[PDB]
Structures are given as C-alpha cells and as structure tokens.
C-alpha cells in the first residue's frame, strides 16, 4: 500500500525484498509530508541557493551555431557546487534523512560524482556517509574517491559480480536491508524502486523550472526542444519535468551509443534493450538472452549503466519524449567543439547531449529551432581521459 502510484504505466514498481518495504514506505511518507512542509522547502531552497549556488546560468552559445538557424542555450548545471546536477537532489534527500531522524547515509556511485555529492551534503549536514563503489570504479576514479574521503565519507569497494555500478547498487540495498533503522539510502538517479524515481525527479525539477523562466525572459517563448543525456535519468527528468505539459516542447533523451549500437557495446537499454526487473524496478535492461544483467559500455562513466529510470521508459512509450543515441566519437567531437568555440569544458556525459543538438543543427541548418541542452556537469574530471584518447589517435 502506498500514497503515490509506484508505476509510470507498466514501468517502475518496488521490486525489493520484503524486509525493505517498510523503509520504502517510510521514505515515501516522509517525502509526501516534506513536500507539504514550508519549513522543509525553505531549508532546501536555502541550501540550493546559498550553498549550491542556484540559480544556474542559461548560456547562449552563438559561436557553435553560427551560419545556421539553430539558437542553442546551455543550462549550466556545470556551475553548481560539486560540478554537476547531482548536488541538487542530494541536498533534498539529506534533508529527508534528517526528517526521518536518520543519522547515516548510504550511496552508490560509479563515475564518482554522485558519491562526491553525497559526501559533500553529508559533511555539511552532519550525516555519516558510506559510499559503495564497484572495485573497478574505485581503481579508475582515484580523484573522486579521494574527494569523498577528504569530505569524511567511508568509501567501500564492491568486489562481487562485475565489480561495477550495478554491484555497488546491490551492495547499497544489501546494507540498507539491515540498517534502514538508522541509515537512509541516497540513491543517485531517477531509477530504482518507488519512491526514488519520483523523489529524484521532484528534487531535480528546478533545472527545468529555471530553464523555462530563463528562456521566456530571453526569447519570449518556450524552447522547441530540451535535450539531456540519460544515464539513469536524473538530469534528464529534472530538465523535462516542468515541460511535460507543454506539449509543443520536444523532450529528447540521449543514451550512450558506446562503440556503436550494432557492436552491442553501448548503454542504450531504453531503445536497444529489453524490459526486465532489476534494481527494484521494471524497466528496460541490457541483459543476456537468458536474463542475466549485461554489462553496458560508454566512454563516459556517468552513462555506463545497463538500465534507465521508469519515467523515461513511460514517456517514451506514450510518445511524449524521444530517445536517441550518440556514440563515443560523436561525444568526443562535441566535447572538443565546446572547449574550442565556447570556452566551456563539458562533462563527457553531457557531451552526448550536446552532440545530438549539434547533429540536429548540422543535419538541417536552415531549420529554425530554439534548443536547450542540459549541461549537467563540467568536464574537469574527463580531461585525462580525453588527453589519452587524443594522443592515441595521433592528434597528440
């Protein structure tokens, strides 16, 4: 029994062990209560503004669209404290943990950005933070691991399974299954069991709300389309949410195409996977023919997840939102283009979104279109990766 619908159409649900159902119920009630609580909202708004730095700029990118009829704005989540949109919802979830009287935080991370966000929020708000991270991720993300540890968080490598994000996802749930009485699970995307897809959306929706206000102010009309990369779905749904009822506004989600969809080495389950049940939800999964959860792949660690949030699967099904893919090489080009022509170093994740906007422009350069790309993070974290790639392909 729940207060809110756990499904978006056929997608979503609460596919957790029975032992965790009271935790999910408790979190839903706390959320529903918090959303009605002006005190909660004021504290959240205070952290967002004075700590994280909201509102974020909306930047018109003139150089990269010159000679075409595309006007492109970037929503600057890259400028949020921590360097990515992940910070927004961790602040809300940290306040929820406090509302429930919880003193500890569990979080999963892959790339490490959500873990850093969880760690910073925990430091600020006096929660003891443990972060589970696949050991292969720990190995690759020494900077983020160290940032988390500087901020007082315990980082616990996960050696089971493929020792990556999904395994960290499981471990977090395993911990929570035994510790929910003291700990809150601060899930890092708009996926997993209800009520997380709903909570994460609501605690990211300021992205789209601000974008709407900013675009009405600057352009006098809504965008033709808003474009975001889809890892698990949080930055995208945060951008989309406030435009869902504005039926003229296109909602485009960009999954990682990796080495190419045809190679099978990608992270695009919404369009190229199969519905399954994993991580507490019924959603598109990349999986083997016999139903083992498959390994995804992307150049960008933040998109390298074999599933997707259920609201995206739903918005796709009904034709409200359209989902596309962008390959490693396309994302790399977009990264280089933004650095060189706008002086902004984008996260490789959001470089997927930018690449798709650039394709919309280049394919039809006399089409008048007003586009917003969610620049969900900065790409400082990616500069070593790009260097190594650019030297190996002989741009040295």
């Amino acid at each position: 029994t729940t207060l809110l619908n756990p499904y978006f159409g056929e997608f979503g649900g609460m596919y957790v062990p029975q032992i965790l159902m009271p935790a999910l119920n408790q979190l839903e009630e706390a959320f529903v209560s918090a959303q009605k609580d002006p005190e909660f909202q004021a504290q959240f708004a205070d952290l967002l503004k004075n700590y994280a730095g909201r509102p974020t700029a909306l930047t018109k990118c003139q150089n990269i669209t010159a000679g075409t009829r595309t006007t492109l704005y970037l929503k600057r989540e890259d400028l949020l404290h921590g360097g990515a949109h992940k910070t927004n919802q961790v602040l809300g979830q940290a306040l929820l943990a406090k509302r429930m009287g919880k003193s500890e935080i569990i979080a999963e991370t892959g790339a490490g950005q959500h873990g850093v966000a969880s760690a910073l929020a925990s430091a600020l708000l006096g929660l003891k933070c443990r972060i589970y991270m696949g050991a292969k991720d720990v190995e690759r993300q020494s900077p983020n691991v160290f940032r988390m540890r500087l901020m007082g968080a315990e980082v616990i490598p996960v050696h089971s399974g493929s020792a990556t994000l999904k395994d960290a996802c499981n471990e977090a749930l395993r911990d929570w299954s035994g510790s929910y009485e003291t700990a809150h699970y601060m899930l890092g995307t708009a996926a997993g069991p209800h009520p997380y897809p709903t909570i994460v959306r609501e605690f990211q929706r300021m992205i789209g709300e601000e974008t709407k206000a900013q675009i009405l102010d600057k352009e006098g009309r809504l965008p033709d389309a808003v474009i975001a990369c889809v890892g698990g779905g949080s930055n995208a749904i945060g951008m989309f949410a406030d435009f869902i009822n504005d039926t003229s506004v296109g909602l485009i989600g960009v999954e990682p195409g990796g080495h190419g969809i045809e190679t099978g080495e990608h992270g695009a389950p919404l369009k190229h996977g199969r519905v399954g049940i994993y991580f507490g939800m019924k959603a598109p999964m990349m999986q083997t023919a016999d139903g083992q959860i498959e390994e995804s792949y992307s150049i960008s660690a933040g998109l390298d997840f074999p599933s997707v949030g259920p609201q995206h699967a739903y918005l796709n099904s009904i034709g409200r939102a359209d989902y596309v893919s962008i390959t490693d090489d396309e994302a790399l080009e977009a990264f280089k283009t933004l650095c060189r022509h706008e002086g902004i170093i984008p996260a490789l994740e959001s470089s997927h979104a930018l690449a798709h906007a650039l394709k919309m422009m280049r394919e039809q350069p006399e089409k008048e279109q007003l586009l917003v790309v969610n620049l969900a993070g900065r790409g400082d974290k990616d500069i070593f990766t790009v260097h190594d790639i650019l030297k190996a392909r002989g741009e040295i």
Binding site: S162, R174, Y278
Partner: protein, 268 residues
C-alpha cells in the same frame, strides 16, 4: 503434487521438524553439485532450497554471493539448472524442491512460462527474493496455475495485515525470516519469533520454516521448540563447499556430518 503437505504430515506424525539445506545449483560445477545434492538428501535433508545462479543476488551475503560466482565460473546457466532439476526429481520422487529465484530470471521469458517449466521438471515451490507481497500477484497466480507453491517471506518487521496476506496467499511453507539483512551464517537472529509463528497458525498459514543465520543444531531445535515446522540453512552449508573445493571427497564427508547433525536436532 502435494510434496510439502505430505512431508509436513509425515513429520507431524513423527513429531519431527524439517531440516532444509540451501545450495546454489552448479556450485562448484554441475557434476559436483548433483553429488552434493545427493549427499544432502542421503544425510537427512527433508527438503531442498536450490538457487539458480544470478548476476545480482541482492538478498544474499558474501557466502552465497560467492557460490553464485563459482557457478558462473563453471559456466552454469538457468537452462542447465532446469536440466539438473529434472534429473534430481527423476532420482528423488518425494522430496520437496524449492527454488530461490530473482525476479528477472522468472520474468525473462514470461512469468507463466517460467512456472510451467518448474511444473514440467517437478519443482514444488518458488521464492522470488526481490518480489515483495506488494508486487507478487502475477507470480503467485502463475505459481498456483502450475501447481507450484509461492513462498512468501514473513519478516521480523511484519504486522497483522502482512501476516494475513502471507497466510492467505502462501502455500507449501511460510518463510519465517530470522532477522533483517541478507543471508549469512555470520549473523544469528536475535528476535523471538513464536508470536509470529502463533499468528500464522491462527490465520491457517502454510507451515513455517525459519531461515537466515541458521548454522547450528541448537538453532534447529529452537525453531521447532518455538512452534515452527522446521528450519532452513544455506550459508553454513555453502561454507563447507567453499572450504573443501580442493577435496571433493572431504566436501561430501563434511556435508554429510553437518546435515546429519542438523537433521538429528529436528527429531528432538
């Protein structure tokens, strides 16, 4: 078939509890797993709980996580598991066989079709570890259509509504969960469960088997003394496999001594 109903009636006649080991199918390999299972039965197992190797066993602690991994190292797949189940049933007509599944393996090729295959090979029950009562409807429906008992978890954090739900919907046995957390012999339950046991009987639930953290004879005796129909032990059993990988002979001998001891604790 009525395998659990028959087992419980016979056990009640002998005033014995059930002892039910869990193992992972195909750990450490198909042939050895078949021999392990025959050893468990010969040593006094009243029923079996059998895991199909899955990529993401999020209700299992490290001991059973590693069993899954050893099975995958051996190339074990669900189809091979179903072959094994058919052969186990072909050898052993009356022992109840329960599967421990994760939802994706059941849903993968169709929930109805999964349960029909269980029926075809002679499985008696299915526990889907990541399906709470709240999401259980299509699973329990398919189970019953195919003469499979849907196993429900009665957690220590359960209330009257849940007790009524699990008593009503469940068949075969009610899984009486010892404690919160995940599987593992490293953590023993510290909650009295006789209240839950009594309420389940009140509501005409399937007989209770206590599981999680059962690793010693005293605990089996304790389960029976509290009014449960018996006890399940997994990690403790899997630890013997893990310890004795290098000596298949010794593995069977220890499994045999362990099961014998555990079973002995149920008769008295």
């Amino acid at each position: 078939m009525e395998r659990y109903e028959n087992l419980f009636a016979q056990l009640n006649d002998r005033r014995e509890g059930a002892f039910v080991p869990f193992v992972t199918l195909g750990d450490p390999g198909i042939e050895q797993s078949l021999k392990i299972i025959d050893t468990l039965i010969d040593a006094g197992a009243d029923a079996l709980e059998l895991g199909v190797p899955f990529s993401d066993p999020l209700a299992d602690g490290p001991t059973i996580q590693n069993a899954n991994l050893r099975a995958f190292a051996a190339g074990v797949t669900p189809a091979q598991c179903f072959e094994m189940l058919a052969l186990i049933r072909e050898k052993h007509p009356t022992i109840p066989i329960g599967l421990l599944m994760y939802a994706n393996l059941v849903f993968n090729n169709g929930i109805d079709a999964f349960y029909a295959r269980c029926e075809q090979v002679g499985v008696d029950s299915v526990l889907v570890a990541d399906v709470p009562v709240e999401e259980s409807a299509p699973f329990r429906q398919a189970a019953l259509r195919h003469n499979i008992a849907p196993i429900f978890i009665c957690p220590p954090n359960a209330d009257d509504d849940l007790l009524r739900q699990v008593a009503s919907y469940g068949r075969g046995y009610t899984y009486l969960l010892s404690r919160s957390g995940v599987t593992g012999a490293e953590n023993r339950g510290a909650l009295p469960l006789h209240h839950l046991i009594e309420k389940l009987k009140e509501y005409h639930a399937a007989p209770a088997l206590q599981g999680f953290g059962i690793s010693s004879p005293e605990q089996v005796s304790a389960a029976v003394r509290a009014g449960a129909a018996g006890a399940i032990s997994g990690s403790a059993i899997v630890k013997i496999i893990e310890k004795n990988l290098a000596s298949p002979k010794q593995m069977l001998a220890e499994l045999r001594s362990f099961v014998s001891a555990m079973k002995a604790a149920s008769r008295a």
